[PDB]
Every structure is written in structure tokens, then in C-alpha cells.
Amino acid sequence: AGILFEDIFDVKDIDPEGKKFDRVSRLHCESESFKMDLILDVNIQIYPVDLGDKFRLVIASTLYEDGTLDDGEYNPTDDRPSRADQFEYVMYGKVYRIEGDETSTEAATRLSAYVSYGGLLMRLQGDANNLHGFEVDSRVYLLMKKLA
Amino acid sequence: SNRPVMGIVQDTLTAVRKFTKRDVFLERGEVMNLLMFLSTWDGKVPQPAILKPRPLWTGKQIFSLIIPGHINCIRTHSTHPDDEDSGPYKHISPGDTKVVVENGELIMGILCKKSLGTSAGSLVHISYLEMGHDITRLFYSNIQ
Amino acid sequence: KAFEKKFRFDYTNERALRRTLQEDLVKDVLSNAHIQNELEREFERMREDREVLRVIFPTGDSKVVLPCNLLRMIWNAQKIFHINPRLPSDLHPIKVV
Amino acid sequence: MNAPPAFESFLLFEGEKKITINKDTKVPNACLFTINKEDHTLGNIIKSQLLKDPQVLFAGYKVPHPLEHKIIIRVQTTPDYSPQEAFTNAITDLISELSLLEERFRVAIKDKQEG
């Protein structure tokens, strides 16, 4: 598998502070049946998004549908493995911080994983039980698909 | 004054900020050219950030290839407000300030005079102190 | 109070110990007494250094110029050895001292 | 006083070879072509034609100095295909396109005048 996370989100805001960038907007999504807030920057010129949209988000450690990793080297002439091409929007990043709700003695109950997709950041808060697949410095894919 | 005496001067410096904005997405051919002008390049084209519906790289994704070795640094853009460091979004930075370089990769932030300039602790100063003159020379030339 | 809390190394609570240090090391720390004496002597030396610093630098200026960048060296070590900060470590504080 | 003559930008002198082939040892199946007395007028066409090929993984060109006339082209291709074959096919396809374009322009002129 290699699918670290999978959920359906709804868009609540596009730019609460304002339009900071011409071609990039920051979605403020909330989950469904998981109660996990999301803050994602999406290229809107290539992949337009507006309010109220529902998309299915998948965060996977590999794209190859069998388990093997990719080594991070780009190669377009590799259609043989039949990668996960059922999604519309795909990004590739590196998780750089896992904040938590720890203390001196008690362990954490809520985490917050940050991933940087070459500039376009993402924060994914929620419960600490379904967020266990994330380790810092690990390459991560993001896959989106709008539900009609 | 134990600072770097030379740094990027005003034309690569007026353009590295625009390069390192979030919006800069580079096509395959443009990436080919820019890598053709890199002297310290391994030979492997990195995976694009945006992979569907069209492969797009990013300016930070190529300045990461420019930055040498495994350099760790944290600077601050010249238009960074006085509330981001205090309130929420400390590590999310809506305006793309708070430059962060981990393992020689530009994770976030916009590069300006306060990062590539002739001030103490700048990115070039860290590159010198960590790698030496022979690598800082290539750093300058490749950036330009 | 902040100085003591940040630099004391409480070895009594033992829940912070189980959370931060490994299991084979926490038993050693809670059993030995020479280790505890060394750990208290370290804080004594730090307090004396604090008083010396306050004499040398009145008006409370922390900024100083020194040859080795310890914090950046620590960051480099963390990234080089793939240290995971969410797990208990295998470093003995006596080995540190 | 130190002005080079104008013809030095397109005339090969005694000893200079037009094109020299060198391999790239960093990555397998990579090759560098150095062309003397050329510029963007040829570099750009060859690069843009190499990029059309689906078996070419890298294709670029650069002019190392504007005061010295020389073109460097780097092409890396997938295995079971060589960059020399990619280069030759690119040149052949460019020639075919230009010939077809000239034929159609000539017929368009003929249609425009006296027609």
C-alpha cells in the first residue's frame, strides 16, 4: 500500500488573510469523520479551486502501487509500474516538522504534520492515532481529486 | 568585522527575490537550461513539485541545487511582520518569509539582501565557515 | 526559578525520565548515587559560572562573539545522524558530563 | 587595437574542427557535443527538436562566453538508444520540416501573385 492517510475534505476558506500571491492560494479545509484541520497551498492557475468544494486527499509514501520507493529521481519514461494516476492533483514534498501536544510526563494526543512541497507548505492537524505514518525528512506525495 | 566582505550585488540580488517567491513554477525546458548553467550539478533532475496535471518545478527547488553541501541556516525576509513569530502560523508563514535551509535545501522563505548579502551569519557566511573558499567560490558563480 | 528549571536535570520525577531517557539508563540513574552527586556538582558549577557572567556583563547583554557555533554544530549533528526527537535516547548524562 | 576581425565569428581557422564529441561520465548514456563557430540560431532549434523525442531525458545548450564563438549541447537518452542517434534524427527532422516549409511558401507565393 504505502498510503499514510486518506480522507475527504471540504473547503472553508481560500485566503482568510488576503491574496498574498498571484498564482497560489491557501485553502483552509476541514475533514469529515476524522475532524482534522488542513491548511494547504494549491496552485490555482493549473488546478482551480473555489469555496465549498469537496476533494479526496491521499498522502502516500510511494506512487508505485506496490511498495517500492522512487529514489526521488525524475523519469517520465516509466509507465510500466502503473502509478496511482486516478487523481487529478499530485505534489511531492518533505515533512519538516511534527509539532505535538506533549508535556513533561503525559504523551501527546494531537499532532500537527508540516510538509513542504518545494515552497508550497501544508499543515495537517488532528488526532495522534491516524497521524503515525509521518516521520521528519521523509519524502511524501499528495494526491487530490474533486468529488462531484 | 568577521563578516563576508563580498556578496550578491543588486542584479542577481533584485532577481533572486523574484525567483524565490512562491509563484515561480518552471517548465521542463526552462529547468533544462538552468541546470545547463550549473557547474556543481550531479546530473539527476529532481522530481517536480507539481506532478499533475503538468510537471512543474519551483524556484526554491533549483536554488536548493545551487546551495552546497548540507548547510543549516535560518534567516528572515525584510518584510517579515512582528506578529507571525508570536501568533499562530509561526512555522507556516503566510507571506513566505522566515527563510529555512535544512540539509542544503531551501525549504521555505524568500532570499534577499539579509540572506545572500554581506552581513554576519548570512547564507554565504555559513557556506564559507562550513565548506571553505573553494566551495564558496562556486556558490557565488553558480548563483550569478 | 527559570534557570533552575531549565538547567537542573530533575532525576526524581522519573516520568520525564522514562519519556526522555531510555529504560536501561533510567534504572541506572535512579539506582546510582555517584551519578547523582556528579549531576548536582554540574549544576553547582553552572551557578558559579552564572554569577561570574553577571559580574562580567552588567546591563544584561547576552550577545557575545565566540569561536565555535555550538547551536549550529548541534543542528548539523542532529541532521547528520538522523536523530528522531520523538523517541527516548541512549545518551548517558554522566557520559555527557 | 585589440579588435577581432568580424569574420572570426563564422570562419573555422587552420586546425579547428567543427564538432567534437565527448562523453559525460557523471550519468550513463550522456554525451556532450561542442560546436565551433555557432550560436543560438542553431542551438535553439537543435534543443527544441531534441525535447520532442520521447526517448530523450535531457537536452540543453549554452554559450559559455558571448565573446567566444562556441556552442555546447548536452543530451541524455534512455537506454537502448544513443544520444548520437538522437542528435542525427533531430537534424534530419529539422531538415525535413524546413524543406516542406519552403515548398509550401513557394506554392503560396505562386497562388498570391497571378492567381
UniProtKB/Swiss-Prot annotation, chain A:
Record PTM N-acetylalanine, positions in chain: A1
GO molecular function, one term: DNA-directed RNA polymerase activity
One cellular-component annotation, GO: RNA polymerase I complex
Pfam entry (one): RNA_pol_Rpb8
Keywords: Acetylation, DNA-directed RNA polymerase, Nucleus, Transcription
Protein family per UniProt: Belongs to the eukaryotic RPB8 RNA polymerase subunit family.
Name by which UniProt lists this protein: DNA-directed RNA polymerases I, II, and III subunit RPABC3
Species of provenance: Bos taurus
Gene it is expressed from: POLR2H
Curated annotation (Swiss-Prot), chain B:
PTM per Swiss-Prot/TrEMBL: The tandem heptapeptide repeats in the C-terminal domain (CTD) can be highly phosphorylated. The phosphorylation activates Pol II. Phosphorylation occurs mainly at residues 'Ser-2' and 'Ser-5' of the heptapeptide repeat and is mediated, at least, by CDK7 and CDK9. POLR2A associated with DNA is specifically phosphorylated at 'Ser-5' of the CTD by CDK7, promoting transcription initiation by triggering dissociation from DNA. Phosphorylated at 'Ser-2', Ser-5' and 'Ser-7' of the CTD by CDK9 (P-TEFb complex), promoting transcription elongation. Among tandem heptapeptide repeats of the C-terminal domain (CTD) some do not match the Y-S-P-T-S-P-S consensus, the seventh serine residue 'Ser-7' being replaced by a lysine. 'Lys-7' in these non-consensus heptapeptide repeats can be alternatively acetylated, methylated and dimethylated. EP300 is one of the enzyme able to acetylate 'Lys-7'. Acetylation at 'Lys-7' of non-consensus heptapeptide repeats is associated with 'Ser-2' phosphorylation and active transcription. Regulates initiation or early elongation steps of transcription specially for inducible genes.
Annotated compartments: Nucleus; Cytoplasm; Chromosome
Family: Belongs to the RNA polymerase beta' chain family.
Chain's role: Catalytic core component of RNA polymerase II (Pol II), a DNA-dependent RNA polymerase which synthesizes mRNA precursors and many functional non-coding RNAs using the four ribonucleoside triphosphates as substrates. Pol II-mediated transcription cycle proceeds through transcription initiation, transcription elongation and transcription termination stages.
Name of this chain's protein: DNA-directed RNA polymerase II subunit RPB1
Organism: Bos taurus (Bovine)
Lineage, uppermost ranks: Eukaryota, Metazoa, Chordata, Craniata, Vertebrata
From Swiss-Prot, chain D:
One annotated Gene Ontology cellular component of this protein: nucleus
Positions where N-acetylmethionine occurs in the chain: M1
Subcellular location: Nucleus
Pfam families per the UniProt record, alphabetical: RNA_pol_L_2
Family annotation (InterPro entries): RBP11 (IPR037685), RBP11-like (IPR036603), RBP11-like_dimer (IPR009025), RNA_pol_Rpb11_13-16kDa_CS (IPR008193), Rpo11-like (IPR022905)
Alphabetized SUPFAM superfamilies for the sequence: RBP11-like subunits of RNA polymerase
Keywords associated with the record: Acetylation, DNA-directed RNA polymerase, Nucleus, Transcription
Gene3D superfamilies in UniProt: RNA polymerase, RBP11-like subunit (3.30.1360.10)
GO molecular function, one term: DNA binding
Gene Ontology BP annotations: transcription by RNA polymerase II
UniProt family annotation: Belongs to the archaeal Rpo11/eukaryotic RPB11/RPC19 RNA polymerase subunit family.
Subunit: Component of the RNA polymerase II (Pol II) core complex consisting of 12 subunits: a ten-subunit catalytic core composed of POLR2A/RPB1, POLR2B/RPB2, POLR2C/RPB3, POLR2I/RPB9, POLR2J/RPB11, POLR2E/RPABC1, POLR2F/RPABC2, POLR2H/RPABC3, POLR2K/RPABC4 and POLR2L/RPABC5 and a mobile stalk composed of two subunits POLR2D/RPB4 and POLR2G/RPB7, protruding from the core and functioning primarily in transcription initiation. Part of Pol II(G) complex, in which Pol II core associates with an additional subunit POLR2M; unlike conventional Pol II, Pol II(G) functions as a transcriptional repressor.
Official protein name in the record: DNA-directed RNA polymerase II subunit RPB11
Annotated gene: POLR2J
